[PDB]
Design a protein around this ligand. Sequence first.
Ligand SMILES: *[C@@H]1O[C@H](CO)[C@@H](O[C@@H]2O[C@H](CO)[C@@H](O)[C@H](O)[C@H]2NC(C)=O)[C@H](O)[C@H]1NC(C)=O
Ligand SMILES: *[C@@H]1O[C@H](CO)[C@@H](O[C@H]2O[C@H](CO)[C@@H](O)[C@H](O)[C@H]2NC(C)=O)[C@H](O)[C@H]1NC(C)=O
Ligand SMILES: *[C@@H]1O[C@H](CO)[C@@H](O[C@H]2O[C@H](CO)[C@@H](O)[C@H](O)[C@H]2NC(C)=O)[C@H](O)[C@H]1NC(C)=O
Ligand SMILES: OC[C@H]1O[C@H](O)[C@H](O)[C@@H](O)[C@H]1O
Ligand SMILES: [Ca+2]
Ligand SMILES: [Ca+2]
Length: 337
Amino acid sequence: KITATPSQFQPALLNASKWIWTGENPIPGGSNIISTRPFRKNITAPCGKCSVCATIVVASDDAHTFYVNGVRIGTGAGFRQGQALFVALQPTWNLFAIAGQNLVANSPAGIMASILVHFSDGTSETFVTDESWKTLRAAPPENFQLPSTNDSNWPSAAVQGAYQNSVWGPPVLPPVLPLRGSNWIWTSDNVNGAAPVGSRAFRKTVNQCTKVAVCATVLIAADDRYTLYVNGATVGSGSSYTVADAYTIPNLHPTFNTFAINATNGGGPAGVIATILITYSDGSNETVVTDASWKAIQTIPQGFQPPLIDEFGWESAKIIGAFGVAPWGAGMVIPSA
Ligand SMILES: *[C@@H]1O[C@H](CO)[C@@H](O[C@@H]2O[C@H](CO)[C@@H](O)[C@H](O)[C@H]2NC(C)=O)[C@H](O)[C@H]1NC(C)=O
Ligand SMILES: *[C@@H]1O[C@H](CO)[C@@H](O[C@H]2O[C@H](CO)[C@@H](O)[C@H](O)[C@H]2NC(C)=O)[C@H](O)[C@H]1NC(C)=O
Ligand SMILES: *[C@@H]1O[C@H](CO)[C@@H](O[C@H]2O[C@H](CO)[C@@H](O)[C@H](O)[C@H]2NC(C)=O)[C@H](O)[C@H]1NC(C)=O
Ligand SMILES: OC[C@H]1O[C@H](O)[C@H](O)[C@@H](O)[C@H]1O
Ligand SMILES: [Ca+2]
Ligand SMILES: [Ca+2]
């Protein structure tokens, strides 16, 4: 049962996390052979909280594949910057599994991750890679990542370093979500690089009736100002086109969700841009961006935000341009993952 409500996005941090490998070289940050190595950790929910979903940040020397409860949720590489991943969880326990690869002979090897678990009651806790994870001094067995594998006589992982103290130094957090891939949109009264003074509304519905939606993460900015609504409830608002806002919606409807925006132009150019990531209970996700599949209207009707209004006399939203275009450029400050 979920009492958590929409909130400012809380970044997962690598500060308490550790670099792990097998200990085949007993020198942490020491030279290791070209190899692939498994890592597993069963994490159980405290008390009587349920776990709902997780924000994940993961970094690797040299590369990684990340699994949750047997499902591949991502592939990545590199220790200078982490990769953001989002996933729905089982309510009481979750098996995290990583395949790490060292790709350069005589080079250091290591995996670092932070798993920020969001609970049914609106609390969070960070879990990290450390000595309590299990590994093998061999290539991963077939199905090493499924819960059905017994990791009981696997050895402990060996710590290679901490966030501040390691051969790698501290990885930079990635952006929570990319704006690359999204579009500044407006009503079709936005011509010759300016739009009238006034408020305009935008709507997007996601409805996969054969899947169970769990959590959404939203990244949004507007020239001049916006208010954002999910299923008619206020999520938040901002007034900056140079600093974006990120939100978590932990209480999604399982099949049908409507995002609505009242955005206001104070004068000159105008636009609204957003990236939305939705997690599904099978471990899959969907990305939605501001584009021409959104609906827009120039006079905002009463109830523009309720989920099931009549969209007659809403137009396709106009693409002003892909993220990057003048006048706003590529420099938006995006919260960390
Ligand atoms: C959302 O899910 C999919 C798979 O369930 C992930 O990715 C595709 O998977 C890889 C892994 O990063 C990407 O490189 C590709 O771009 C996708 N396939 C292509 C282009 O063929 C993705 O990681 C997940 N997102 C999360 C967990 O945040
Ligand atoms: C992860 O740990 C959990 C909790 O310790 C394991 O869960 C269970 O295992 C018991 C013995 O099989 C069951 O009879 C319990 O009902 C159940 N406990 C809870 C709290 O759910 C779980 O199997 C582990 N998963 C993996 C992949 O090891
Ligand atoms: C859309 O947003 C704008 C601004 O966020 C809303 O505007 C105004 O309406 C108030 C009436 O409640 C007035 O007191 C203010 O003069 C004015 N406020 C601002 C900050 O402009 C607008 O009503 C919003 N809603 C709709 C449905 O248009
Ligand atoms: O980036 C263009 C910028 O310039 C204008 O004159 C306005 O004050 C802002 O609302 C913004 O639209
Ligand atoms: Ca290496
Ligand atoms: Ca403006």
